[PDB]
Symmetry: D3
Subunit: 236 residues, 6 copies
């Protein structure tokens, strides 16, 4: 079993999170999972949709037409967001809201925008891992503006994928591996080691209990390195 990148089965790709990446957002990060590069921004808006309950957070995902090996059609000109985009967006939104105590956010709405500049697998996991850092920077801004009702950060959140490649569970899939793997798992967890999201899919041979547990265990292991990178970035 030899991964295309020469990486070991339990080895993450080189990762880097850069804060204050673009100048307008209350929070802006360039997150890099190897060749996967995504810009995640957080935009604070006054008011809320239809609540009286707490604040709100919603997310959107986008890809540059040639962030991919083969050009992908611009959803703007096709006049419609595909199933994949909607799936990834919802995931991001759920994941980030799970990290917040919306009642302490105030009557504000946070807009998360994750745009893939260069894709090579795991854009959704990189997006969540990086968006969390951007989110924290944004909360510091709103706190400064005295627009919050306490510290809404419940707990850090990160994500990573796992897939069966050459019959072996490998961590943090790149495009080639994801294209070849018929069985994969996307996981979103917190600092406390709690799962907020687990999604496993099998196109051919169904994955059995031990198999799933094996993938789950590999993901948790690598999750620790991600939280570390997030903290390091926030302390830099």
């Amino acid at each position: 079993m030899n991964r295309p990148s020469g990486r070991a089965a339990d080895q993450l790709r080189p990762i880097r999170i850069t804060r204050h990446y673009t100048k307008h957002a209350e929070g802006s990060v360039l997150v890099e999972f190897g060749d996967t590069k995504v810009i995640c921004t957080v935009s604070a808006e006054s008011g809320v949709p239809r609540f009286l309950k707490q604040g709100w957070l919603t997310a959107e995902y986008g890809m540059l037409p040639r962030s991919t090996g083969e050009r992908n059609q611009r959803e703007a000109s096709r006049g419609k967001q595909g199933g994949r985009t909607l799936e990834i967006q919802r995931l991001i939104g759920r994941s980030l809201r799970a990290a917040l105590d919306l009642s302490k956010l105030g009557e504000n709405t946070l807009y998360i925008d994750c745009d893939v500049i260069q894709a090579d697998g795991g854009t959704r996991t990189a997006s969540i891992t990086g968006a969390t850092v951007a989110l924290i920077d944004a909360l510091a801004v709103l706190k400064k503006r005295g627009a919050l009702k306490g510290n809404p950060l419940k707990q850090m959140v990160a994500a990573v994928s796992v897939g069966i490649y050459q019959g072996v569970p490998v961590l943090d899939l790149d495009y080639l591996e994801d294209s070849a793997a018929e069985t994969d798992l996307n996981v979103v967890m917190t600092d406390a080691g709690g799962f907020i999201e687990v999604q496993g899919t099998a196109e051919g041979a169904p994955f059995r209990p031990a198999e799933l547990n094996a993938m789950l265990e590999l993901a948790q292991q690598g999750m620790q390195e991600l939280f570390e990178l997030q903290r390091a970035a926030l302390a830099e």
Copy 2:
């Protein structure tokens, strides 16, 4: 812990699958998970999208405007299918294709249409469980027409949900339970006991390993009753 329906935590709702429900489809079933009633039809078409590889199977999901407690906007007049619909459709399509050896299906395309007539939770799981029966009836039709290349049925597939209600994992959620539960799990498995799909989401307290395993174990248990019902229906 008392479920709204008075059902035990490990008890499925009354279930029934009726074949040859509507007269035009090559396969048509009315599947009932308690008050959740869905019509699942299979439409065989000659030819395939863009392949040379095998046949194909794709699925669509729909709900009647008042199949729900509160009227839901007709996607046709809104001129767009929402995120939920796209999510459910993709799941159904993946699940049913997993049940087939597309290479033995021939140069044909199977259209799966799952429409909710009355909803009360678990429309996607009922849809998959019932669609499989409809799919088998459809394969018998194509076989008769001598349009297949062997028996494409790899293995039966069924689905069920599980959620944390009143701090307890309960099987086959109705609308009230799903509305209250912040942690749930949707699972799609096969006869051999293999998973083809596992999706767990937590909006509040993240679910821990044992918790997930507990939900997974409850789902598998109830999955056996579903395969039984499917066989009984096909032998009737």
Copy 3:
């Protein structure tokens, strides 16, 4: 002249109206005109569009993808309602509003949803005939809730079609007859024997006065059986 179904020229198909068909709507009926099966629900909403004048009633029509012999494209995924759908919807809305004294309905809006589960001609006429029964059940609900300003039911309404098949006017067309007939008539009438809608179209030989009168007379005749069925259903 032998109709495909073996039915006489002045014979309606077997008809049945089932009330309280699905559990959420204020009114819900399964109406059956032979093999044509439509679910008609009525959804009461507080308030009105842009009036100060009276209540309101609007209708929508839909078909399951395989409610037809040949699969029809789901308007939701095509992202647009076709001409036929809009035509049928408007007809239903006009027909049902004609049955009401909107000034006695109160500041409420009634949503009529007619979805074809199985089609075999006359879906629009079955829809109107059945929707009226559902509408009455809904009015009883609003009356109970003390949300009305008197009894808004002006008069019962029903509908039926007529077409020239094999050179002979035949009543209540099925799909085969409608497909073959180049001259047809759709009629919507009331208890008092008044017309609220008359639509005759000829694709080939134009229909002459006597011809139209003949079709009109045949429709009125069969209309009496429909009002009878509606009353019987409401008294059951």
Copy 4:
């Protein structure tokens, strides 16, 4: 009973048909029904949609934003054609195809475009009456080009409306009358005096048999003047 225009109940508005109105179309007419002014063009195209059977004819309807008393939203910017437009378009298409022996049209497709420059009721009837003249001019062009298979003109077609105003059936409704009338009738007939289309609708008191016959008789009467105007225009 005094009509707004001072016109008698059986009196048509001043009518005029001008051929070769705009220079690009194979047929182009400005038809005027009083203050209702519509430009009807016919565009000949080589080939056909999906036939092997005959030629084809399809129609489209449009209104200038201020062809109406109150500005109406441009369907182009709303990105959608309303129910009214689709209804009128289909009617026009059916009406004009009824006038043709499509088998003698050849493998060609005729595009009918009816655009209202100034509206004051009866735009659809004026459209049909004028489009027929444009259609004939277009057929002469294709005949000259030797693109036809004989003379496809089966018979002239014209249209007019009738409505109950002040309790009296009046011929050729203007906007004010149509706005006030709760009962109206649109009719499309041929030279031979045959009906190709009859549509009567009642919003309040249903119209009875004699009433309908009365409206029908008034329409036929005025139809003769229209065929006369069409012939006069074609002989000019």
Copy 5:
């Protein structure tokens, strides 16, 4: 160098502006630049979009399907306005607003609708030149209604094009010339001889300074005749 129309390089096409063309608009003009015929209407509406600052003016452009040599698809049925339409609309809106002191217009919104009945080049320039006359008629109406805050007419505005045909700058391009020319210029100026819009584009040989100045000088020259025609029309 011989222009298709036999016109000299510095000669405008025959031009005519007819006011009060259609009866509903507060301002309505038929403007004719040779075979290019456009109807320009102005619709006054009470209130404004999102301002507190002044009134507003916005414009829309449309073409009849066969106003062109070859039928152009109706944007209404395509459900979208093309790039060309949006470009022309914005230009018209900017041009006409430049002619107004919006602060003296009051809390009103003017809707400009320019629809091409017959096209032969320069529809956008004819549109602006004619819309200005319609705009003035509309202002007189609002003034009469005492809905204005003074005279908002800052200065008359007109437009014309210039292009390199056969290596020579020619004024007011028709369709054939515009189709052949790789270098053209559209200009919008005022009475005082000031430019509000200048747009030059070269598809092949880039145009040099002197070349541009030459085109600019030719346009200004012909602009005087246009202002003359506008005044003559308003004094008629």
Copy 6:
């Protein structure tokens, strides 16, 4: 007159062009005009739209939701590209095609994608200036693949804007200046000093001849520095 950035009236912002920016495109550049940062990629595709004549080149423009001071709605979710986007896209496409001898490009189609990562005025001019460099890199790739018919590069192309700020013509506008200026000019020129595009617009006081010439002269002056930067980047 003091520009917000402290820049002189004839001083360009700091500019930088980085080639091979993202790894998938045949050409990819990050172009920076001060705080305006745009990624321009070129995607080579085999074949052409509807030609037999030469190759083709088309362009698309996009902005990240928070590439702007205030979040701008994602066109993908709005399901439509605004007027501004279409305008900029067309400009880019025209500009880049002007730089090519499409007959020497072969039966290929070049897709230009310009996405704004951070905006601060002049995104369209930066886009064109940078896209040209990306285009050249892409041509070298196709030449290597032996897919071209000679060297299609006719001449380098660059662009810059000019506007009246504080009554003075200033070069290369940032967002603040563009927001304040009522008179601006966008220009696209070639190496030979030829204009391929000139667009001047005035919202208030119309710009006179000398004024336009002054802006034009300032633009040409700064254009030389841009061609220099492009060459330097290609020789690096």
